[PDB]
Amino acid sequence: GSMSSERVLSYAPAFASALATSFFQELSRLKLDVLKLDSTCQPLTVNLDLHNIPKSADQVPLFLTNRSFEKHNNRTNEVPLQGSIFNFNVLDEFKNLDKQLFLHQRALECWEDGIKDINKCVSFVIISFADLKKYRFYYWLGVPCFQRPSSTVLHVRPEPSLKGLFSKCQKWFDVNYSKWVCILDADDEIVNYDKCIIRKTKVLAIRDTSTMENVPSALTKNFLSVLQYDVPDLIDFKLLIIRQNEGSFALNATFASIDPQSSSPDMKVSGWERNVQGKLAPRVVDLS
């Protein structure tokens, strides 16, 4: 870099799983109904509380309970997040499943959704195996985060002149609880993402799930991948990372490729949650 404070943007895991015993109790009750199946995929809903993230956290917790299996129809200050649980009834299959291929398939659905509506490119998946005899549960949270093209990086530096917008973005996100992104229109009004407007105005704000200083959620990758698809000629733009704490920040951003011989493109996918030891592997819970 040549500009002071120019850096490549780096990311933090989008969510941290927090499974209550009730989640496993419900999983067990429901598994009893599908013993004849090799595997099942059931939708889940979690409610994110981005206003009350514990100071000890690096990102918003994903609170899974018995209620996560239910259809949610109506909660005070919260963002509904849809996902699913893939339960495998054969432990060997759970173990042997190619996890990168699986997460890549999930990311492809998020991508397909996102290029129609950028607000629909976020999801989570839990894979599980439940030993009902031992009451031991293996699980692994994946959050499909995709970088397409794989070789694009984002160079950024601070843009504090835009800090005034943070309060308005926070409020807009509060009201529009189904939305992950907003933009400025040509007259600096905050409005829903529109790929024809952003091509002109070049200011995008994202509802961030990270609390790490100057390090946005990996979900940012998803939104930026959709942005590149929507506006291929966009190189320089402003990016606001909006948080409900005091940690929002604004960036003067520039797309660049680290591979001059890249096509136009590969999709890099990541997002499996590290376990307690920090390894990329499932978590296991003994509830006996």
From Swiss-Prot:
It comes from the Eukaryota. It is found in: Cytoplasm; Preautophagosomal structure. The C-terminal 40 residues are required for homodimerization, as well as the interactions with ATG3, ATG8 and ATG12; and the C-terminal 17 residues are required for the ATG8 lipidation. Belongs to the ATG7 family. E1-like activating enzyme involved in the 2 ubiquitin-like systems required for cytoplasm to vacuole transport (Cvt) and autophagy. Activates ATG12 for its conjugation with ATG5 and ATG8 for its conjugation with phosphatidylethanolamine. Both systems are needed for the ATG8 association to Cvt vesicles and autophagosomes membranes. Autophagy is essential for maintenance of amino acid levels and protein synthesis under nitrogen starvation. Homodimer; homodimerization is required for ATP-binding. Also interacts with ATG3. This is Ubiquitin-like modifier-activating enzyme ATG7. The lineage of its organism: Eukaryota, Fungi, Dikarya, Ascomycota, Saccharomycotina. The chain holds residues 1 to 289 of 630 of the full protein.
